[PDB]
Design a protein around this ligand. Structure first.
Ligand SMILES: Cc1cc2c(cc1C)N(C[C@H](O)[C@H](O)[C@H](O)COP(=O)(O)OP(=O)(O)OC[C@H]1O[C@@H](n3cnc4c(N)ncnc43)[C@H](O)[C@@H]1O)c1[nH]c(=O)[nH]c(=O)c1N2
Ligand SMILES: Cc1cc2c(cc1C)N(C[C@H](O)[C@H](O)[C@H](O)COP(=O)(O)OP(=O)(O)OC[C@H]1O[C@@H](n3cnc4c(N)ncnc43)[C@H](O)[C@@H]1O)c1[nH]c(=O)[nH]c(=O)c1N2
Ligand SMILES: N[C@@H](CCC(=O)O)C(=O)O
Ligand SMILES: N[C@@H](CCC(=O)O)C(=O)O
Lengths: 531, 532
């Protein structure tokens, strides 16, 4: 009969399983490792307390507003909020402070230190940035360029249209950089010369807006991220105890109602590609398993290591698996003896007075994230995310992570602490005396992810994205995972991909279940609807 | 008292040392590791014979023509050739077969297998590539777009001008992709619509021209790379015994004149007193302070970002350049087999591969296969294959399976590579597994000593930030060098050019009376052509 093989016990595969279970469709989940959650990965420090953990992957959720009952207003990540409520986790959501809840975080650029909001220029005039651009500020400039695209895409979601996406796709051959260099012109109200920005100005924008190399990726990703971050209000939330609680709770729910763990997939294909009723065959852990349909949540680079002969990918799908671009990321968590960023003071006696929030710098660590969990408890977290990098910053830092050599582990620690000391204006020894343990992770050096997440280059969305939204293997192989969405690097992207995969499965096997599917999980993947 | 501190015992630092030694300038070389050569790295398989090695980094040199005495004609890499001759290595250079010296290498794209030169379309019509584009071919299309820039830069070198570079810089904000999408129009002789290529066509070009993601990097690098590869004749050469022979020979030459400080990683560089005009330079390496009059750094830009450069007084552009000037990734996988099956073997249908040197290409994860040119005419030909050589996105993805320290992922890596090799050559997996002996793999983007394979600039890097690092720092006493400080990124000549410029600036400010001899031995210019 019908039994769906779900590849990958990440949040996308677990979500697919929730849907199928609610519709009484048999399924199995095949997972290569001994754990569920995938890129929801919470590391707990052995020497710490209840809140001495940090999330190596997902950690913050910009959700729509919600009522006391867990009903979420329409929004980009309503689907995530409704999942929490569905699992009885709404009351386990705690505030995530994107900015500090007390004094503002630090900025350290070009050797100039300041607090967020103090209006420092960070020596930009010495870089050749004229005073008019400095007065306007990076945020307003980028918003003026991204705004028109973002507003059109938000109108698509609110009004149930796709013309905004059509407009984004006519511009999808642009990177953010090439859009500034060859098309964008400043709003006349800025009083700037009606000229395209120079590379010097564009790189100044990237320095404070995103990460080194971000602007060489697709303009569309810049637009989609502004929408995801709510720059188009949102309740920033994290999960009490770490993001691991979400997949662990789903797994425990599915258990009491199967899982095939420690079985890496090496082949996917039809048993007989010339038979219309041929089942699907998945080789996992050296054993053949048969299914009617297969929903894959494996990252695209991982699928490139799987034998997909007899899955009958069309020529566009196979090229898309290779070309659709992924991005890197690293994180470094440090257990300290105390939350010095909250209770301590700098070398001149000035209190940091930081609670949650983030600090930013052009030094290699780039971004520091102070924990929001546990701040209002008897045992606040002593664990800091000392570095969180993207693109070029993550690529370079990755060479110092996971070397297995004590000499490089020591170099890494000294670099991170030194960068931290310069950002916060402390001595190196002040932080070394308080260090307990270090944990680091490079998602671009992990066979299970082969990159942090999808981060498409120019042209990817307009040319190759749609091919993987079609099924393969005579309609019996469905591609899913966060890469199959317009919310890359977000949990909602994985949830959206699972919605589409199950939709196509029901469409071809049992369309009579579509009304119930719509009723429980939404009439659309992205188009807004009330709770 | 002059004494130059050279940071890094790679080919750039060793070359700097050769120059200074020829000019009687005292120097010391500080090296973090226990070896010299840097990205010239030859791996020898212990279970193999004389030619069972492979070069993990540099392996092939497109040199100018040369005479019997080792004099090289003017060209992009004359400087490399003259270095070989200077060291008495000219007769140790052997042919490098860029294409196979017997039957052509393989191409395997979109499930279609063919030999190089057979004119296959690899199912391109099913991708939406119209027949006119296929008939013209990727090579002609890319040459038509790159040609004008490459010709102007080659004229700069021949006629001793910089207008070609100035024109290239006017277009440096383009990536190769954005140039095709928003500016390039086909030559009217192509008979194509006078319109910019679609993304589908541009990605088709990238698939057969370079590597996944190459076209999102700077257009200038694509132009400069075509000049370096000679696509604008060249004698492709490699070094008998491996590229390691070059830095080893330099080291042995310098010792009998020692000034090597090994196992001393640099952690700080700066003036002893930044407010004193006569302040010496201080280098902290291996936990020890060392003082010099001037410092020539050949450390990669990402490595300098891990060094305390306070008191080197970089200007705001230089410090940003260290962060933003982009590097690119690369991996290599070498496999020792029991026999050179690519030369003596046959596919599942009995057709002999008949490959000697050369390369095969595929859109499969391994991307490029390189058959050895060394040893092909000896009693013990090489049994060692470069089963995979990747760039950009292909190298980034493959890197996650390299250096994991887990046997399970070493096995997955081996099975993937062998499976890809079998599909490219039309053999069974077991045919290659039965012949496998040993595997060695390397990811230059997961290596603290390089932090990337080499400079691979994005759009705007050359026009905006490159020049800042061509100026010295630390009151004129810190000189930035290494292959990143050149227009020949990812080439030995780039490192040599950077050393020429660094020593030139050093001599210019400390002892200009040595310039004539410097010009006489090492060239009147870094890049502008001259006769041997
Ligand atoms: C550093 C970092 C930071 C963030 C985020 C990611 C990262 C890397 N994200 C994004 C979010 O973590 C991500 O989009 C989803 O967790 C992806 O879920 P999937 O199910 O698509 O894949 P995921 O990769 O999580 O799951 C795939 C599963 O397949 C398994 N697998 C792999 N190869 C296999 C094989 N051969 N056979 C069988 N199984 C195999 C894996 O082990 C894994 O269990 C995020 N999101 C968010 O909402 N907020 C945030 O703040 C962040 N931040
Ligand atoms: C995979 C691959 C393939 C190729 C090539 C590179 C790579 C990575 N190249 C390019 C060529 O290898 C490269 O451009 C030069 O070797 C670079 O020499 P440098 O001296 O500039 O740096 P390189 O990196 O070689 O040397 C720097 C030195 O500094 C040391 N160091 C690092 N950190 C330090 C610290 N903190 N303190 C002290 N010392 C430190 C390093 O250990 C090293 O000895 C090439 N070229 C070519 O001509 N033909 C080819 O075919 C190829 N192919
Ligand atoms: N969404 C993740 C990853 C970055 C991104 O969204 O692009 C974050 O909040 O950091
Ligand atoms: N030069 C090296 C690296 C690639 C490049 O030059 O860009 C090679 O021949 O493979």
């Amino acid at each position: 009969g019908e039994r769906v093989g779900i590849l990958g016990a990440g949040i996308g595969g677990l979500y697919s399983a929730l849907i199928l279970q609610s519709l009484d469709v048999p399924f199995e989940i095949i997972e290569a490792s001994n754990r569920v959650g995938g890129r929801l990965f919470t590391h707990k420090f052995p020497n710490g307390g209840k809140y001495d953990y940090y999330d190596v992957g997902a950690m913050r959720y910009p959700l729509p507003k919600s009522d006391d009952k867990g009903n979420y207003q329409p929004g980009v990540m309503q689907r995530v909020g409704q999942l929490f409520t569905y699992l009885g986790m709404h009351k386990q959501l705690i505030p995530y402070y994107f900015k500090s809840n007390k004094s503002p975080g630090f900025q350290y650029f070009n050797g100039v230190r300041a607090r967020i909001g103090e209006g420092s220029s960070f020596d930009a005039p010495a870089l050749g940035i004229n005073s008019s651009l400095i007065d306007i500020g990076v945020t307003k400039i980028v918003n003026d360029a991204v705004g028109p695209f973002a507003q059109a895409l938000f109108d698509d979601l609110q009004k149930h249209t796709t013309t905004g996406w059509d407009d984004m796709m006519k511009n999808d051959a642009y990177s953010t950089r090439s859009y500034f260099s060859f098309k964008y012109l400043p709003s006349p109200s800025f009083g700037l010369p009606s000229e395209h920005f120079s590379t010097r100005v564009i790189n100044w924008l990237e320095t404070f807006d995103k990460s080194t190399g971000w602007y060489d990726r697709g303009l569309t990703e810049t637009v989609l991220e502004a929408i995801a971050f709510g720059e188009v209000e949102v309740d920033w939330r994290c999960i009490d105890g770490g993001s691991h609680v979400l997949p662990d709770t789903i797994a425990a729910f599915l258990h009491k109602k199967a899982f095939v763990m420690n079985a890496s997939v090496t082949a996917i294909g039809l048993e007989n590609p010339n038979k219309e009723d041929s089942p699907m065959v998945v080789v996992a852990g050296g054993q053949k398993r048969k299914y009617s349909h297969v929903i894959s949540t494996l990252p695209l680079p991982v699928l490139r290591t799987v034998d997909l002969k007899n899955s009958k990918l069309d020529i566009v799908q196979s090229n898309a698996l290779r070309k659709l671009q992924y991005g890197p990321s690293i994180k470094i968590g440090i257990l300290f003896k105390e939350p010095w960023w909250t209770t301590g003071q700098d070398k001149n006696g000035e209190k940091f007075d930081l609670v949650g929030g983030q600090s930013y710098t052009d030094l290699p660590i780039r971004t520091v994230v102070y924990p929001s969990y546990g701040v209002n408890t008897n045992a606040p977290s002593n664990t800091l995310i000392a570095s969180y990098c993207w693109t070029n910053d993550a690529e370079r830092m990755g060479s110092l992570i996971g070397t297995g050599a004590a000499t490089y582990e020591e170099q890494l620690e000294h670099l991170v602490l030194s960068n931290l000391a310069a950002v916060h204006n402390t001595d190196y020894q002040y932080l070394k005396d308080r260090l307990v343990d270090v944990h680091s992770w490079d998602w671009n050096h992990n066979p299970l992810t082969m990159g942090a997440f999808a981060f498409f280059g120019p042209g990817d969305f307009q040319d190759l994205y749609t091919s993987l939204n079609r099924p393969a293997a005579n309609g019996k192989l469905h591609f899913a995972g966060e890469a199959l969405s317009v919310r890359h690097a977000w949990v909602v992207g994985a949830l959206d991909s699972a919605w589409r995969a199950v939709y196509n499965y029901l469409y071809v096997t049992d369309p009579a279940k579509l009304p119930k599917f719509f009723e429980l999980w939404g009439k659309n993947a992205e188009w807004f609807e009330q709770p």
